[PDB]
Amino acid sequence: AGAQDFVPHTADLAELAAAAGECRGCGLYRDATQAVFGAGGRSARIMMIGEQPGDKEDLAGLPFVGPAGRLLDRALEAADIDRDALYVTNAVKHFKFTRAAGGKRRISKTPSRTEVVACRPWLIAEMTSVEPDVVVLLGATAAKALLGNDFRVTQHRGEVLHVDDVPGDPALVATVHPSSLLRGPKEERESAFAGLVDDLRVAADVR
C-alpha cells in the first residue's frame, strides 16, 4: 500500500507537494529533513525523474541543485532545453543516507525496490498531473521504477521506449544519471556527457 493513502485526490502540484510533506509511506521520512517533491508546472512537455533527493536537495527542498544538478543544467543547455519548461522529480521523495567520519557530505544510499514501489503513487500522481509527452529516466532506480526491476539503462541508450502500464503512454528515454558523470578519466567523462546530451535531444525531439 505504500504512500497511496497519503496521496490526495487532486492533480494540483502544490497540493500534492504539501501532502507529500506528511507522507510516511515508507521508512525514509524519519531521517530525512523533508520531502522533496518535483519542481515545474503542469504544462511541461518533458518530465525528468532521478533517483532521490541528495544531500543538497534534502535541505534546499528542490530537486537537482547540487553538483549533479549543475552538470545536468550544462547538458540541458547544450541540448537547447529550457529547464524552466521541464517538470523535474525523483523516484523516491525522501533522502536515504549515511555519513562517514571525516566526510564532506551525507552519502546517498540506494532505495530498495520496496521503497521505490511504496513511493510510486507520488510519481503516478505527478505523471497524471503533468501529462508529459516524454519522460527522461535518469539512472537505474528511476528507469526500473517505470520499466521493470530487470531493466538495464546501459543496454538501451538512445532508444525511445513505451510501456503500456504507464498512465498516458508517454515516450520514455532512459539515460545515465548526471552524478555518474562527475568523476572518472577526462575522455570518458567527455564521451559520457555527449551521450547524455544526445539522449536529452532524443527526448526533446519526441513529437
Dist. CA 55–CA 96, nearest whole Å: 9
- CB closer to ligand SF4, 28 vs 72: 28
Dist. CA 18–CA 135, nearest whole Å: 23
Nine-digit cell string for 14: 502544490
Nine-digit cell string for 175: 539515460
Evaluate whether 83 touches 186 at the Cβ level (below 8 Å): no
Least CB distance to ligand SF4 at residue 111 (A): 7
- CB closer to ligand SF4, 27 vs 195: 27
- CB closer to ligand SF4, 45 vs 94: 94
- CB closer to ligand SF4, 47 vs 92: 92
23 is in an annotated binding site: yes
Nearest CA to 48 out of 34, 68, 32, 29 is that of 68
Dist. CA 162–CA 169, nearest whole Å: 7
Least CB distance to ligand SF4 at residue 118 (A): 4
Q: Which residues bind ligand SF4 (CB under 6 A)?
A: 2-3, 20, 23-26, 28-29, 35, 92-94, 118-119, 122
Least CB distance to ligand SF4 at residue 24 (A): 5
9 is in an annotated binding site: no
- CB closer to ligand SF4, 141 vs 180: 141
Nine-digit cell string for 59: 535541505
Least CB distance to ligand SF4 at residue 57 (A): 13
Nine-digit cell string for 81: 532545453
Dist. CA 206–CA 37, nearest whole Å: 25
Please state whether beta strands 97-98 and 107-108 pair in parallel, antiparallel, or not at all (unpaired). Answer: antiparallel
Least CB distance to ligand SF4 at residue 164 (A): 25
156 is in an annotated binding site: no
119 is in an annotated binding site: yes
State the binding site for [4Fe-4S] cluster. 23, 26, 94, 119
